Design a protein around this ligand. Sequence first.
Ligand SMILES: CC(=O)N[C@H](C(=O)NCCCBr)C(C)C
Ligand SMILES: [Cl-]
Length: 130
Amino acid sequence: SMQEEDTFRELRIFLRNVTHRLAIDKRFRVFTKPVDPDEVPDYVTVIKQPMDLSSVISKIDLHKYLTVKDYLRDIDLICSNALEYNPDRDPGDRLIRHRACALRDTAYAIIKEELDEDFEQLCEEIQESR
Ligand SMILES: CC(=O)N[C@H](C(=O)NCCCBr)C(C)C
Ligand SMILES: [Cl-]
């Protein structure tokens, strides 16, 4: 229905605003664009589902997220990809793991404070009815 289309529209506006707030934070610059295969030719070979905040915006706009839970699965991938690709004890890998964890925690904290649980439940029920 048009009411349901309005609900998904509101979801996309909410997700674009959360994603923009993560993207303008200086800590998260490394996550704003895909890993360039130049610098890192093995990346695409180790990480099977690369994810970054530009990809998340593209997905919002393609109507790929019908719930906040689906969007958080992709935020979780940004975190878990960095834990998997940069697991060593040296400071460069610890810094990216801490930043990727902080991204994830920040997205979850904004959603805890600003997503109404009844709005999420509505999205879940429309998605399940399709
Ligand atoms: C997203 C990611 O894991 N990036 C790794 C990383 O530590 N970069 C940090 C920053 C500088 Br441009 C890289 C080894 C592929
Ligand atoms: Cl830095």
